[PDB]
Amino acid sequence: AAQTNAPWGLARISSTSPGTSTYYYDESAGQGSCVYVIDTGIEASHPEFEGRAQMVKTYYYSSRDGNGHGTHCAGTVGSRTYGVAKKTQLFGVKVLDDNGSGQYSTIIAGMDFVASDKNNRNCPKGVVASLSLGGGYSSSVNSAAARLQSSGVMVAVAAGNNNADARNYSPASEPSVCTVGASDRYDRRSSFSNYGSVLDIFGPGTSILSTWIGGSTRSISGTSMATPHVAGLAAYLMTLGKTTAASACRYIADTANKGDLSNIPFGTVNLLAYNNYQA
Ligand SMILES: Oc1cc2cc[nH]c2cc1O
Ligand SMILES: [Ca+2]
Ligand SMILES: [Ca+2]
Numbered sequence: 001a002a003q004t005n006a007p008w009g010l011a012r013i014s015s016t017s018p019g020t021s022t023y024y025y026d027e028s029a030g031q032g033s034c035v036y037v038i039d040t041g042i043e044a045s046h047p048e049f050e051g052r053a054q055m056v057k058t059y060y061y062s063s064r065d066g067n068g069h070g071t072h073c074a075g076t077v078g079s080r081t082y083g084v085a086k087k088t089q090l091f092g093v094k095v096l097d098d099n100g101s102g103q104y105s106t107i108i109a110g111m112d113f114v115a116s117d118k119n120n121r122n123c124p125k126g127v128v129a130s131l132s133l134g135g136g137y138s139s140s141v142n143s144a145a146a147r148l149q150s151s152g153v154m155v156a157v158a159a160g161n162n163n164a165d166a167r168n169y170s171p172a173s174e175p176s177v178c179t180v181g182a183s184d185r186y187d188r189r190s191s192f193s194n195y196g197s198v199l200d201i202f203g204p205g206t207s208i209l210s211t212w213i214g215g216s217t218r219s220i221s222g223t224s225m226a227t228p229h230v231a232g233l234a235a236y237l238m239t240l241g242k243t244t245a246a247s248a249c250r251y252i253a254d255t256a257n258k259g260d261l262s263n264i265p266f267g268t269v270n271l272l273a274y275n276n277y278q279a
Contacts, residue, residue: 001027002279007082008185009204009229014277016257018187024277026240030085032125033235035077036114036153037228038107039070039132040100042092043213046071048079053090057113059106066098068213072220073132075211076228077235082210082217084232085239089123096133104170107133108144115151126238126245128154130231132224134171142174149176154238154245156180156231158223165196173198178234178249182206182226183272189263193223196268200249202261203229203273230273237275 003010006023014024036056043065044053053074055063065071070092078088095110096102111129118127129148134157135141149155157171159181166172172179172194179198182190182205189195190206205226212218234248243251256271264270 001025007209009208010084012204013084013229013233013273014275018185024279025236025275026277028239029087030078030232030235030239031087032123033085033128033239034089034091034118034121034123035085035128035130035231035235036091036093037070037074037077037130038093038095038110038114039073040067040096040098041065041070041094042074042090043071044092046211046215048075048081048211049090050080052078052088053092056091056093056117057110058094059110060094060097063094065213067096067100068218069100069224070094070096071213072210072218073130073224073228076208076225077130077232079211084229085235088232088235104135104138104141108141111144111148114153115148118153126154126235127152128156128231128235130228131155131157131171132227134158134160134169136170137168137173138170141170145171145174146176152245154178154234154248156227156234158227159199160194161192161222162194163192164194166194166198167196169194178230180223180227180230182223183261187260187262189261190221195265199268201230201253201256201269201271201273202226233273233275
């Protein structure tokens with residue numbers, strides 16, 4: 001299948017060169033898999049989700065996304081027009097408030113929640129967890145991320161936007177999960193993207209168009225936008241039967257476009273997420 005005039009990030013992931021505008025993908029499009037977006041919530045009623053999205057847990061007064069960040073990330077994972085895995089099932093867990101902030105204890109609770117909750121869901125092709133969040137190093141937060149991954153969920157986390165070594169940032173510094181850096185449409189590391197040896201892969205993160213609250217759309221930037229590109233790609237590859245939750249990150253790195261990125265510091269991988277689609 002092919003989405004013509006697709007957002008640059010989607011075209012990039014199914015391309016071997018920058019500057020193309022068609023997103024080529026397998027029609028299975030991630031159906032049968034499930035992706036938990038642990039963020040500010042998801043506007044499930046948005047037309048772009050076609051009823052494939054649902055709030056599953058809040059840690060605040062309401063489960064609605066009053067911020068937009070979570071809805072944006074979810075859209076990149078699996079909305080019809082802006083998503084990587086267009087037929088995946090989306091579950092929202094609101095651990096961040098409408099200002100986009102949350103405390104470590106509730107973020108940890110949200111992760112433990114997902115590890116348990118996936119056991120009551122029908123996700124035959126696999127389960128993915130997308131975490132476009134993070135803060136200063138915390139061994140408890142890293143530990144919660146490692147537990148989720150070991151429970152059998154493919155965990156993808158943002159590297160962070162401090163243009164620094166991701167080793168001092170928690171979600172990102174946990175070695176067992178998939179740490180995602182950001183790149184722009186000219187194949188340069190995004191100027192805000194953290195880097196370092198803990199990064200596993202890079203994904204499109206600068207000026208990413210996706211869904212927004214109020215049934216709208218908006219273009220924003222961040223490793224927060226790169227993360228869902230690979231969470232969505234993992235779901236897509238899992239329903240294709242190419243990999244499993246435990247090895248998806250390594251599989252994505254193994255099959256990535258290598259050496260294409262510029263502005264990559266020595267010691268940081270030069271790998272860009274690639275679906276390897278051949279029609
Ligand atoms: O990168 C991000 C990190 C955190 C940490 C808490 N909320 C966040 C939202 C972000 O977009
Ligand atoms: Ca090339
Ligand atoms: Ca890793």
